A paper describes a structure:
Here we report that pyrrolysyl-tRNA synthetase (PylRS) and certain PylRS variants accept α-hydroxy, α-thio and N-formyl-l-α-amino acids, as well as α-carboxy acid monomers that are precursors to polyketide natural products. Here we report that the tolerance of MmPylRS for substrates with multiple alternative substituents in place of the α-amine extends to Methanomethylophilus alvus PylRS (MaPylRS)38,39 as well as MaPylRS variants (N166A V168L, MaFRS1 and N166A V168K, MaFRS2) that recognize diverse l-phenylalanine derivatives. We expressed and purified an MaPylRS variant containing these mutations (MaFRSA with N166A and V168A) and demonstrated using RNAse A and intact tRNA analysis that it shows high activity for derivatives of malonic acid 14 carrying m-CH3 (17), m-CF3 (18) and m-Br substituents and low activity for l-Phe. In vivo studies using traditional and engineered E. coli strains confirmed that MaFRSA supports the biosynthesis of model proteins containing internal, aromatic, α-hydroxy acid monomers. This work describes the first aaRSs that accept α-thio acids and α-carboxy acids that could support carbon–carbon bond formation within the ribosome.
To better understand how 2-BMA substrates are accommodated by the MaFRSA active site, we solved the crystal structure of MaFRSA bound to both m-CF3-2-BMA and the non-hydrolysable ATP analogue adenosine 5′-(β,γ-imido)triphosphate (AMP-PNP). The structure was refined at 1.8 Å resolution with clear substrate density for m-CF3-2-BMA visible in the electron density map. MaFRSA crystallized with two protein chains in the asymmetric unit and an overall architecture resembling previously published PylRS structures. The two protein chains in the asymmetric unit are not identical and interact with different orientations of m-CF3-2-BMA. In chain A, the pro-S carboxylate accepts a hydrogen bond from the backbone amides of Leu121 and Ala122 and the phenolic -OH of Tyr206. A hydrogen bond from the Arg150 guanidinium positions the pro-R carboxylate for nucleophilic attack with a distance of 2.7 Å between the carboxy oxygen and the α-phosphorus of AMP-PNP. In chain B, the orientation of m-CF3-2-BMA is flipped relative to the conformation bound to chain A. The pro-R carboxylate accepts a hydrogen bond from the backbone amides of Leu121 and Ala122 and the phenolic -OH of Tyr206, as seen for the pro-S carboxylate in chain A. However, in chain B, the pro-S carboxylate is rotated away from AMP-PNP and towards Tyr206, resulting in loss of the hydrogen bond to Arg150 and a longer distance of 3.9 Å between the carboxy oxygen and the α-phosphorus of AMP-PNP. The two alternative poses of m-CF3-2-BMA in chains A and B correspond to a rotation of ~120° about the Cα–Cβ bond of the substrate that largely maintains interactions with the m-CF3-2-BMA side chain but alters the placement of the reacting carboxylate.
Residue numbers in the entry:
A (entry chain B): -2 to 275
B (entry chain A): 1 to 275
Write the structure that this text describes.
């Protein structure tokens, strides 16, 4: 709210980001009159750019941006020997408690319950671990699998959070080499296939995996990876070694396409491929 | 020879097996049960081979691949692929005439007092196609593939979560029914199922649909406007739309014995049982 180095107001920024995918919060003006004259021209550009974009998209449709991204990453993983799997969106109360997501946990508040014993999955690891364990019964080789699909969380409506988002989870179980070097190679395969070859690996605290490697771009988390802990497999004393990585595909797409909010590239009845339709 | 496998035997055979067990006939119970024993063994042995073969040649998932084949075929017809939220409002369901009095209301999974898991794609596609009509004079051609949810009975071609492909063309160039029949043909050929029948059927939502059936099995329900549900969605022009059950299509094309094997699962992967 500085009246000396005058920026666009907070309201003006939301109005600009509604239709525009430029960058707006850095502009500085001499006075209010110059801020507001610039806002007028910026807002007009943003809205006309949006209308051109949606008209060209209607006239020349492609696969959806999120589906295309999923396909690029999936074909890359399959070429590295990963099996694509699809698991149910419902998961049982039992599976959630087996991840130590229990009545006392921070993530437990965020769970959507469907009935007394089942919920919408907030993560992919529970189902993926089960499928991976069963596939290990049929082979002496390592098992590498991945899934892409919707997970659901109750969220604080902050910067890069959706209640429904599309996660990619990849996992590798069985005989290991240098586990972390293999995992880092997988992340690189995914990140290059996504079109985001430049990123940082930062270690972040976690209540579920204890310690994770995060993937960050300009300080924004797009992925957590881990060498697998063994609390999910409570029914066996002896566990298989495994590791995995979970990527936020809407976050990847948003960063790559430089959309101004995370609501624009995924599932929506207000946005289609970055453009506002109403 | 009039003795057949019992229903319990059929379900046991189909658990691991993808043959056509319901055709077999036997002289007496002894021969039925001796055949059952052999068929169960073959089914389990064949299944183990299949799952090892998948591990040896990893691939895209069979459902995802079918989705991509149909979706690329529809893009090639000028359709816009959209993705819409799995959550829809109680009001959106009411505008489809899915209201508290109606029996259909009880198949809906509720999230909160005013939000539900979508049991169908038309509520969101209605909303998007109407908005896109604000930007063009031409046909608005869109489609979505995504999970839908219904409380059901036994798994007779029925899942609780299934994948629907719904397409819609609002304000088509040509008779809306003729255009629909052409787009259904595009989908079915792209799915590898060029032989099918169009059959007019009743619906508690649409009152009348054109269904796609293969050997009497419903794989699609379609509808043509102007339609009585159009007013509540601010639609005032001809349109045609169709919703396909992608797991049903995949099951029929691959000859899987149940609809549980080709879709999302923690027990099945591409037609084979993993546990
Ligand atoms: N609500 C959400 N909306 C969009 N993407 C999400 C959401 N939650 C998680 N993701 C993405 O999915 C990945 C899964 O990691 P996970 O550790 O479960 O989330 P997280 O640690 O809570 N990330 P954050 O909530 O931003 O701090 C993350 O790296 C994100 O890229
Ligand atoms: N529970 C389900 N499991 C799998 N596919 C389904 C299910 N319900 C509907 N579908 C598929 O989705 C398509 C469009 O939905 P809709 O026409 O509303 O289903 P429906 O008329 O209730 N089918 P049915 O239950 O066999 O009488 C159907 O033609 C089926 O192919
Ligand atoms: O719980 C979570 O923090 C997420 C992210 C995650 C971290 C490690 C390994 C995986 C895996 F195996 F599914 F791919 C996933 C989730 O489980 O989806
Ligand atoms: O999804 C539904 O509502 C229907 C399928 C359907 C019939 C007509 C038009 C559409 C449309 F508009 F989405 F494309 C979809 C159902 O069978 O459930
Ligand atoms: Mg979080
Ligand atoms: Mg994280
Ligand atoms: Mg039904
Ligand atoms: Mg029917
Ligand atoms: Mg029907």
């Amino acid at each position: 709210g500085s009246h000396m180095t005058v920026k666009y107001t907070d309201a003006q920024i939301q109005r600009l980001r509604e239709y525009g995918n430029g960058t707006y919060e850095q502009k500085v003006f001499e006075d209010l009159a110059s801020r507001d004259a610039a806002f007028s021209k910026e807002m007009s550009v943003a809205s006309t750019d949006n209308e051109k974009k949606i008209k060209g998209m209607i006239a020349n449709p492609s696969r959806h941006g999120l589906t295309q991204l999923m396909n690029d990453i999936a074909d890359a993983l399959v070429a590295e020997g990963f099996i694509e799997v699809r698991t149910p969106i419902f998961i049982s109360k039992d599976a959630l408690a087996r991840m130590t997501i229990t009545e006392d946990k921070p993530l437990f508040k965020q769970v959507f319950w469907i009935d007394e014993k089942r919920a919408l999955r907030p993560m992919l690891a529970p189902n993926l671990y089960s499928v991976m364990r069963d596939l290990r019964d049929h082979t002496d080789g390592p098992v590498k699998i991945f899934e892409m699909g919707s997970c659901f969380r109750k969220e604080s409506h902050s910067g890069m959070h959706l209640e429904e988002f599309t996660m990619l989870a990849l996992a590798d179980m069985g005989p290991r080499g240098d586990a972390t070097e293999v995992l880092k190679n997988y992340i690189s395969v995914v990140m290059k296939a996504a079109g985001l070859p430049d990123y940082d690996l930062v270690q972040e605290e976690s209540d579920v995996y204890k310690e994770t490697i995060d993937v960050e771009i300009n300080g924004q988390e797009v992925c957590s990876a881990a060498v697998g802990p063994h609390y999910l497999d409570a029914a066996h004393d002896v566990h298989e070694p495994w590791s995995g990585a979970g990527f936020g595909l809407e976050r990847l797409l948003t960063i790559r396409e430089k959309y101004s909010t995370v609501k624009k590239g995924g599932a929506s009845i207000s946005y289609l491929n970055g453009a506002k339709i109403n």
